[PDB]
Amino acid sequence: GVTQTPRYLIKTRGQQVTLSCSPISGHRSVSWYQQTPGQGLQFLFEYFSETQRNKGNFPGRFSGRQFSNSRSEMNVSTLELGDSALYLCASSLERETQYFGPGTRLLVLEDLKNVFPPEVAVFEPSEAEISHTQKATLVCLATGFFPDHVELSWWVNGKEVHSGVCTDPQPLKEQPALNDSRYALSSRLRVSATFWQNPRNHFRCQVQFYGLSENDEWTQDRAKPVTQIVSAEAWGRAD
Amino acid sequence: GQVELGGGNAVEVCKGSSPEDFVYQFKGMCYFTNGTERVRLVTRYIYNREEYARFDSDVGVYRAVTPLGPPAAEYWNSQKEVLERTRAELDTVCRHNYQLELRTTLQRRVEPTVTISPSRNLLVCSVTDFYPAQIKVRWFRNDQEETTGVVSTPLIRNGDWTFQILVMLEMTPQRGDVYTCHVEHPSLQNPIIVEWRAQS
Amino acid sequence: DIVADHVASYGVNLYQSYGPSGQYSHEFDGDEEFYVDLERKETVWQLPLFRRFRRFDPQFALTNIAVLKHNLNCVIKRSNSTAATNEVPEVTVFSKSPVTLGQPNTLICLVDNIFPPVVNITWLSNGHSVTEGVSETSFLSKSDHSFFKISYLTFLPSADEIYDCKVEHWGLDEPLLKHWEP
Amino acid sequence: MKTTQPPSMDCAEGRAANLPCNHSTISGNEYVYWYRQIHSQGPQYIIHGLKNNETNEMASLIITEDRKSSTLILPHATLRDTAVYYCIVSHNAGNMLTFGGGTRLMVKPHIQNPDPAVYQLRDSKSSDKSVCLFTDFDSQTNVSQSKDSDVYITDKCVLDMRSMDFKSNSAVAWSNKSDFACANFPSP
Ligand SMILES: *[C@@H]1O[C@H](CO)[C@@H](O)[C@H](O)[C@H]1NC(C)=O
Ligand SMILES: *[C@@H]1O[C@H](CO)[C@@H](O)[C@H](O)[C@H]1NC(C)=O
């Protein structure tokens, strides 16, 4: 489909950002959009044959580029707090139906002093649930992380499982009165009673945090919140 | 009312993008008959005065006119996205933009102006500035309609949404003659008559 | 060709490579409805009736003409870089109304079979280039895929008869000077 | 936008989901498009139409002959069809793509055997911390209670155990006061 990189991005004031997008094979009309809760889907600019056919009403700091293989790029200069958004890429055959990509979640902050990795913990199912419904439910808890750029996945015996899993759709703000509040996310894994009561089964809640890079600068006394994988585990027990 | 549209130029198959000149044309033509009862959309892809690929609503698919655009017509038929809107443009573009012609163009009437002036003997009945370019101009000589000695130039399109024609008459001046010039035009409920008398 | 009660040209997309120039216009029964200024991004209707009831977004032209620039470089490479044959134009000068020696009138210079659409029209009054009161229409399409352009000159008839229409084109060896007086 | 939609729309899982849309000001040259999107994710193209009723294998779309309104129809609404569905118009002439309010569709699941219970779980790394879990409750239950001081409650969550086609709702709540009680407000 429509390839769009990078997926997540965390920047500060004054920096610049270059976004890329590979369209559908056979398409050569790449459209750019900015999706914000306070402005909706705003058109940016459209590139077709290495030229800017259509253009919105955005400042000169929002520029674009396109190459011969229809892959388009977009650059922003002198980022502001209002520039943080989900930048979408719409691939079109020419003027026909547009197909959007995954989008690049951009975040602009005054500084990196409030970037935290999640503290992931796994909660074993109580013996009272296993005796009543004959089903064990593990609860994973990731709290105290910013931004919400995070991905959770369960692993059983080193294999990522999807059957019987569930994750909260949107993270929860621990201080809703503050806009810089650390987020929190929960997810559940439900298995049979006999499967949890087998010591050979190994349950692990993996959490992928997209934060700072190894090339960014860090000054705070806290450990650098680089892109890492925080995961807690819980072995099955048979009592 | 709402914004109008035009013909959609289908994309070519290449791997992206006196003095000499290379000209590329594209005409979104449409042929209405009996109002909006027989609309026909025919888009023409022309390269240097040579039409190499065309679409026809009566056909339903693209076709190559010259051996220059089989690669374009066969590719424009393969893409379902292109053929979907190209077929639908007869309703999207033509059958829609024709409805504005009723409000504007097809209701436009302009009364012509008729003047008879000799040239020294040739008489010239000059019908000028009219629309919609449908007229019947006749030369008479005292209740008898002249024909053999009448020159009729073709309709002259002035380019400013008006038309012009000149109907001439060779004659022999006989005392008592009256040369009337009938002009029949849709904007005129009754025809305009201009006469030139024989005297002296 | 095709017989019909009315023929509309809702495309007339043009783009040549001599000078990177284009033209978008809609035509109904041979006459031009409007033309899109590809530089100022404006729709210029040729009738006041259209300016009060019609509507057209000039972005469609810029979106459409950009496809011609792609297809032009396309078919050039498929046609072994085949140039355009310079057809010989022909000029016919006449008046919009019967000219009287006192009441002003409009002089019309019609140039037919213009291909490629790279032509100039300049009025010559007594050997001098008449500049005040000169207007010309955009290129108008023809069935044989050529063009024809019409020029105008607002004047007042008098004893001066030198009213030529200088037309320079590649199909002509020397510039044509066609002057006609009723 | 030139369209209008109802933002509050939910239906039962498996049954048809008729998402309406009114566009009285649409012209004969404007298509009707339908996009859905999970927030924080790229929008997904569904189906588009101009005249007549068209059917993609994802969903169907009907348009009235007078063109005043159109409805998006989902045959069997599943759990994955719970995004925000947008109804937009387009000239299909290289123009922009403008979204409106949309329709937040929620697919209420089917709970054949509801058994609401308030469980309490213990952390494996430290028995001091704990969380509580409300599960096997009704699908049509407003589980979102107001958060107090250091008392957090999450939204619902539907687990689909494909090994035994068993589905049930669930919601996690925790606190930092470590004096967990997790009190249990009537069910009907
Ligand atoms: C077309 O011709 C038929 C013949 O009777 C007539 O009834 C109709 O009004 C005409 N115009 C249309 C269908 O637009
Ligand atoms: C006249 O047209 C010719 C093209 O044949 C070219 O020299 C130029 O476009 C024009 N020059 C002048 C002086 O008008």
PDB file of C-alpha atoms in Angstrom, chain D residues 6-182:
ATOM      1  CA  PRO D   6     -25.204  11.913  12.981  1.00  0.00           C
ATOM      2  CA  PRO D   7     -22.194  11.472  15.287  1.00  0.00           C
ATOM      3  CA  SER D   8     -23.854   9.062  17.765  1.00  0.00           C
ATOM      4  CA  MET D   9     -24.398   5.716  16.029  1.00  0.00           C
ATOM      5  CA  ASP D  10     -24.044   2.242  17.518  1.00  0.00           C
ATOM      6  CA  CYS D  11     -25.474  -1.144  16.597  1.00  0.00           C
ATOM      7  CA  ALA D  12     -25.306  -4.783  17.626  1.00  0.00           C
ATOM      8  CA  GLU D  13     -22.474  -6.991  16.412  1.00  0.00           C
ATOM      9  CA  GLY D  14     -23.338  -9.154  13.413  1.00  0.00           C
ATOM     10  CA  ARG D  15     -26.381  -7.082  12.458  1.00  0.00           C
ATOM     11  CA  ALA D  16     -26.405  -4.519   9.662  1.00  0.00           C
ATOM     12  CA  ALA D  17     -24.968  -1.048  10.294  1.00  0.00           C
ATOM     13  CA  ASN D  18     -26.803   1.640   8.300  1.00  0.00           C
ATOM     14  CA  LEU D  19     -24.759   4.843   8.534  1.00  0.00           C
ATOM     15  CA  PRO D  20     -26.767   7.674   6.921  1.00  0.00           C
ATOM     16  CA  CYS D  21     -25.556  10.869   5.277  1.00  0.00           C
ATOM     17  CA  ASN D  22     -27.427  13.914   3.960  1.00  0.00           C
ATOM     18  CA  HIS D  23     -25.991  16.008   1.105  1.00  0.00           C
ATOM     19  CA  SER D  24     -28.879  18.022  -0.337  1.00  0.00           C
ATOM     20  CA  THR D  25     -26.544  20.588  -1.940  1.00  0.00           C
ATOM     21  CA  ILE D  26     -24.623  18.008  -3.998  1.00  0.00           C
ATOM     22  CA  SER D  27     -24.290  18.548  -7.745  1.00  0.00           C
ATOM     23  CA  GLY D  28     -24.381  16.111 -10.641  1.00  0.00           C
ATOM     24  CA  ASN D  29     -20.575  16.293 -10.923  1.00  0.00           C
ATOM     25  CA  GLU D  30     -19.698  15.508  -7.281  1.00  0.00           C
ATOM     26  CA  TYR D  31     -19.047  11.947  -6.148  1.00  0.00           C
ATOM     27  CA  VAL D  32     -19.966  10.598  -2.712  1.00  0.00           C
ATOM     28  CA  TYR D  33     -17.027   9.136  -0.789  1.00  0.00           C
ATOM     29  CA  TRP D  34     -16.912   7.227   2.501  1.00  0.00           C
ATOM     30  CA  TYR D  35     -13.811   6.998   4.698  1.00  0.00           C
ATOM     31  CA  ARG D  36     -13.339   5.411   8.112  1.00  0.00           C
ATOM     32  CA  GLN D  37     -10.462   6.009  10.498  1.00  0.00           C
ATOM     33  CA  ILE D  38      -9.289   4.853  13.897  1.00  0.00           C
ATOM     34  CA  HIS D  39      -7.879   7.899  15.671  1.00  0.00           C
ATOM     35  CA  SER D  40      -4.072   8.193  15.699  1.00  0.00           C
ATOM     36  CA  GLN D  41      -4.097   6.137  12.474  1.00  0.00           C
ATOM     37  CA  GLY D  42      -4.393   6.805   8.759  1.00  0.00           C
ATOM     38  CA  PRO D  43      -7.856   6.935   7.201  1.00  0.00           C
ATOM     39  CA  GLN D  44      -9.111   3.962   5.203  1.00  0.00           C
ATOM     40  CA  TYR D  45     -10.956   4.206   1.900  1.00  0.00           C
ATOM     41  CA  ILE D  46     -14.211   2.242   1.893  1.00  0.00           C
ATOM     42  CA  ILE D  47     -16.394   2.907  -1.155  1.00  0.00           C
ATOM     43  CA  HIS D  48     -17.418   5.798  -3.394  1.00  0.00           C
ATOM     44  CA  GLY D  49     -20.349   6.408  -5.705  1.00  0.00           C
ATOM     45  CA  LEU D  50     -22.012   8.923  -7.996  1.00  0.00           C
ATOM     46  CA  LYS D  51     -25.291   7.392  -9.212  1.00  0.00           C
ATOM     47  CA  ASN D  52     -26.967   4.041  -8.515  1.00  0.00           C
ATOM     48  CA  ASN D  53     -25.955   1.702  -5.679  1.00  0.00           C
ATOM     49  CA  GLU D  54     -22.428   0.267  -5.732  1.00  0.00           C
ATOM     50  CA  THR D  55     -21.062  -2.639  -3.679  1.00  0.00           C
ATOM     51  CA  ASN D  56     -17.464  -3.211  -2.721  1.00  0.00           C
ATOM     52  CA  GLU D  57     -16.746  -6.456  -0.902  1.00  0.00           C
ATOM     53  CA  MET D  58     -16.124  -4.366   2.232  1.00  0.00           C
ATOM     54  CA  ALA D  59     -19.474  -2.544   2.331  1.00  0.00           C
ATOM     55  CA  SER D  60     -22.341  -1.311   0.173  1.00  0.00           C
ATOM     56  CA  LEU D  61     -23.473   2.230  -0.603  1.00  0.00           C
ATOM     57  CA  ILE D  62     -26.913   3.336  -1.803  1.00  0.00           C
ATOM     58  CA  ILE D  63     -27.810   6.738  -3.260  1.00  0.00           C
ATOM     59  CA  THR D  64     -31.359   8.010  -3.663  1.00  0.00           C
ATOM     60  CA  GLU D  65     -32.440   8.819  -7.212  1.00  0.00           C
ATOM     61  CA  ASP D  66     -32.996  12.438  -6.145  1.00  0.00           C
ATOM     62  CA  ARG D  67     -29.393  12.447  -4.783  1.00  0.00           C
ATOM     63  CA  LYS D  68     -30.434  14.241  -1.577  1.00  0.00           C
ATOM     64  CA  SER D  69     -29.028  11.631   0.814  1.00  0.00           C
ATOM     65  CA  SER D  70     -26.935   8.466   0.870  1.00  0.00           C
ATOM     66  CA  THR D  71     -26.328   5.723   3.425  1.00  0.00           C
ATOM     67  CA  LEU D  72     -23.350   3.448   4.028  1.00  0.00           C
ATOM     68  CA  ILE D  73     -24.448  -0.128   4.753  1.00  0.00           C
ATOM     69  CA  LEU D  74     -22.303  -2.764   6.466  1.00  0.00           C
ATOM     70  CA  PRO D  75     -23.626  -6.324   5.995  1.00  0.00           C
ATOM     71  CA  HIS D  76     -22.406  -7.940   9.231  1.00  0.00           C
ATOM     72  CA  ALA D  77     -20.782  -5.395  11.543  1.00  0.00           C
ATOM     73  CA  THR D  78     -17.778  -6.919  13.313  1.00  0.00           C
ATOM     74  CA  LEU D  79     -15.572  -5.642  16.127  1.00  0.00           C
ATOM     75  CA  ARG D  80     -13.047  -4.214  13.648  1.00  0.00           C
ATOM     76  CA  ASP D  81     -15.748  -1.965  12.121  1.00  0.00           C
ATOM     77  CA  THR D  82     -15.792   0.424  15.097  1.00  0.00           C
ATOM     78  CA  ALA D  83     -13.918   3.424  13.651  1.00  0.00           C
ATOM     79  CA  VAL D  84     -15.193   6.918  12.780  1.00  0.00           C
ATOM     80  CA  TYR D  85     -16.893   6.903   9.378  1.00  0.00           C
ATOM     81  CA  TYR D  86     -16.704  10.056   7.256  1.00  0.00           C
ATOM     82  CA  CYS D  87     -19.071  10.941   4.400  1.00  0.00           C
ATOM     83  CA  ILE D  88     -17.530  13.427   1.964  1.00  0.00           C
ATOM     84  CA  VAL D  89     -18.110  14.744  -1.550  1.00  0.00           C
ATOM     85  CA  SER D  90     -15.455  15.164  -4.227  1.00  0.00           C
ATOM     86  CA  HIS D  91     -15.237  16.434  -7.795  1.00  0.00           C
ATOM     87  CA  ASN D  92     -12.549  13.837  -8.643  1.00  0.00           C
ATOM     88  CA  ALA D  93     -10.657  16.576 -10.492  1.00  0.00           C
ATOM     89  CA  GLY D  94      -7.434  16.743  -8.506  1.00  0.00           C
ATOM     90  CA  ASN D  95      -9.167  18.750  -5.780  1.00  0.00           C
ATOM     91  CA  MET D  96      -8.576  18.538  -2.036  1.00  0.00           C
ATOM     92  CA  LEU D  97     -10.132  16.057   0.403  1.00  0.00           C
ATOM     93  CA  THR D  98     -12.172  17.765   3.130  1.00  0.00           C
ATOM     94  CA  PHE D  99     -13.625  15.913   6.120  1.00  0.00           C
ATOM     95  CA  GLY D 100     -16.585  16.838   8.290  1.00  0.00           C
ATOM     96  CA  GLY D 101     -17.886  15.654  11.646  1.00  0.00           C
ATOM     97  CA  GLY D 102     -18.224  12.010  10.673  1.00  0.00           C
ATOM     98  CA  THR D 103     -20.067   9.234  12.480  1.00  0.00           C
ATOM     99  CA  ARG D 104     -18.454   7.579  15.511  1.00  0.00           C
ATOM    100  CA  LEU D 105     -19.675   4.001  15.075  1.00  0.00           C
ATOM    101  CA  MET D 106     -19.492   1.659  18.074  1.00  0.00           C
ATOM    102  CA  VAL D 107     -20.145  -2.060  17.583  1.00  0.00           C
ATOM    103  CA  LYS D 108     -21.762  -3.354  20.768  1.00  0.00           C
ATOM    104  CA  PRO D 109     -20.743  -7.029  21.133  1.00  0.00           C
ATOM    105  CA  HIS D 110     -23.015  -9.947  22.054  1.00  0.00           C
ATOM    106  CA  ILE D 111     -22.715 -11.342  25.587  1.00  0.00           C
ATOM    107  CA  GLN D 112     -24.662 -14.607  25.641  1.00  0.00           C
ATOM    108  CA  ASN D 113     -23.735 -15.476  29.254  1.00  0.00           C
ATOM    109  CA  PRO D 114     -22.996 -12.298  31.242  1.00  0.00           C
ATOM    110  CA  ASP D 115     -21.422 -12.857  34.669  1.00  0.00           C
ATOM    111  CA  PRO D 116     -20.216  -9.478  35.961  1.00  0.00           C
ATOM    112  CA  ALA D 117     -17.557  -9.879  38.642  1.00  0.00           C
ATOM    113  CA  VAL D 118     -14.957  -7.615  40.242  1.00  0.00           C
ATOM    114  CA  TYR D 119     -11.642  -9.469  40.427  1.00  0.00           C
ATOM    115  CA  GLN D 120      -8.406  -8.228  41.983  1.00  0.00           C
ATOM    116  CA  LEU D 121      -4.973  -9.152  40.640  1.00  0.00           C
ATOM    117  CA  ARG D 122      -1.523  -9.096  42.233  1.00  0.00           C
ATOM    118  CA  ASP D 123       1.703  -7.916  40.617  1.00  0.00           C
ATOM    119  CA  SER D 124       4.256 -10.659  40.013  1.00  0.00           C
ATOM    120  CA  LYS D 125       7.299  -8.445  40.635  1.00  0.00           C
ATOM    121  CA  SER D 126       5.908  -7.002  43.889  1.00  0.00           C
ATOM    122  CA  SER D 127       2.974  -8.199  45.992  1.00  0.00           C
ATOM    123  CA  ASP D 128       2.546  -4.637  47.303  1.00  0.00           C
ATOM    124  CA  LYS D 129       1.042  -3.336  44.052  1.00  0.00           C
ATOM    125  CA  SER D 130      -2.302  -4.553  42.730  1.00  0.00           C
ATOM    126  CA  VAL D 131      -5.033  -3.842  40.181  1.00  0.00           C
ATOM    127  CA  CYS D 132      -8.735  -4.639  39.941  1.00  0.00           C
ATOM    128  CA  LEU D 133     -10.632  -5.978  36.936  1.00  0.00           C
ATOM    129  CA  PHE D 134     -14.321  -5.755  36.020  1.00  0.00           C
ATOM    130  CA  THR D 135     -15.136  -8.305  33.320  1.00  0.00           C
ATOM    131  CA  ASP D 136     -17.902 -10.525  31.919  1.00  0.00           C
ATOM    132  CA  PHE D 137     -20.360  -7.643  32.349  1.00  0.00           C
ATOM    133  CA  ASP D 138     -22.980  -6.352  29.909  1.00  0.00           C
ATOM    134  CA  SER D 139     -21.940  -4.977  26.531  1.00  0.00           C
ATOM    135  CA  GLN D 140     -24.333  -2.033  27.007  1.00  0.00           C
ATOM    136  CA  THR D 141     -22.844  -0.655  30.216  1.00  0.00           C
ATOM    137  CA  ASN D 142     -21.259   2.755  30.820  1.00  0.00           C
ATOM    138  CA  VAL D 143     -18.172   1.496  32.651  1.00  0.00           C
ATOM    139  CA  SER D 144     -16.455   4.897  32.445  1.00  0.00           C
ATOM    140  CA  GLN D 145     -16.784   6.196  36.001  1.00  0.00           C
ATOM    141  CA  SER D 146     -15.235   9.497  37.041  1.00  0.00           C
ATOM    142  CA  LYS D 147     -11.601   9.381  38.142  1.00  0.00           C
ATOM    143  CA  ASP D 148     -10.939  10.531  41.709  1.00  0.00           C
ATOM    144  CA  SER D 149      -7.606  11.478  43.322  1.00  0.00           C
ATOM    145  CA  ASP D 150      -5.135   8.824  42.102  1.00  0.00           C
ATOM    146  CA  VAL D 151      -7.995   6.506  41.076  1.00  0.00           C
ATOM    147  CA  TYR D 152      -7.905   5.494  37.404  1.00  0.00           C
ATOM    148  CA  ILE D 153     -10.515   3.558  35.411  1.00  0.00           C
ATOM    149  CA  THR D 154     -10.110   2.464  31.791  1.00  0.00           C
ATOM    150  CA  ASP D 155     -12.737   1.991  29.091  1.00  0.00           C
ATOM    151  CA  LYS D 156     -14.255  -1.309  27.996  1.00  0.00           C
ATOM    152  CA  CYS D 157     -12.366  -4.008  26.106  1.00  0.00           C
ATOM    153  CA  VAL D 158     -13.689  -7.051  24.229  1.00  0.00           C
ATOM    154  CA  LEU D 159     -11.559 -10.205  24.255  1.00  0.00           C
ATOM    155  CA  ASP D 160     -12.197 -12.620  21.372  1.00  0.00           C
ATOM    156  CA  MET D 161     -10.775 -16.027  22.308  1.00  0.00           C
ATOM    157  CA  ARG D 162     -10.716 -17.579  18.839  1.00  0.00           C
ATOM    158  CA  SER D 163     -10.028 -21.009  20.363  1.00  0.00           C
ATOM    159  CA  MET D 164     -13.573 -21.192  21.787  1.00  0.00           C
ATOM    160  CA  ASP D 165     -15.412 -18.214  20.165  1.00  0.00           C
ATOM    161  CA  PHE D 166     -15.929 -16.778  23.665  1.00  0.00           C
ATOM    162  CA  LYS D 167     -16.237 -12.995  23.959  1.00  0.00           C
ATOM    163  CA  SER D 168     -16.587 -10.814  27.048  1.00  0.00           C
ATOM    164  CA  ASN D 169     -16.054  -7.208  28.089  1.00  0.00           C
ATOM    165  CA  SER D 170     -13.372  -6.084  30.536  1.00  0.00           C
ATOM    166  CA  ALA D 171     -12.027  -2.928  32.169  1.00  0.00           C
ATOM    167  CA  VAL D 172      -9.002  -2.323  34.403  1.00  0.00           C
ATOM    168  CA  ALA D 173      -8.833   0.022  37.395  1.00  0.00           C
ATOM    169  CA  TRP D 174      -5.923   0.786  39.712  1.00  0.00           C
ATOM    170  CA  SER D 175      -4.694   3.296  42.283  1.00  0.00           C
ATOM    171  CA  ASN D 176      -1.540   4.407  44.079  1.00  0.00           C
ATOM    172  CA  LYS D 177      -3.007   4.496  47.605  1.00  0.00           C
ATOM    173  CA  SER D 178      -2.278   0.715  48.027  1.00  0.00           C
ATOM    174  CA  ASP D 179      -5.367   0.334  50.261  1.00  0.00           C
ATOM    175  CA  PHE D 180      -7.353  -1.364  47.525  1.00  0.00           C
ATOM    176  CA  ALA D 181     -11.005  -2.219  48.169  1.00  0.00           C
ATOM    177  CA  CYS D 182     -12.721  -2.006  44.740  1.00  0.00           C
TER     178      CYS D 182
END
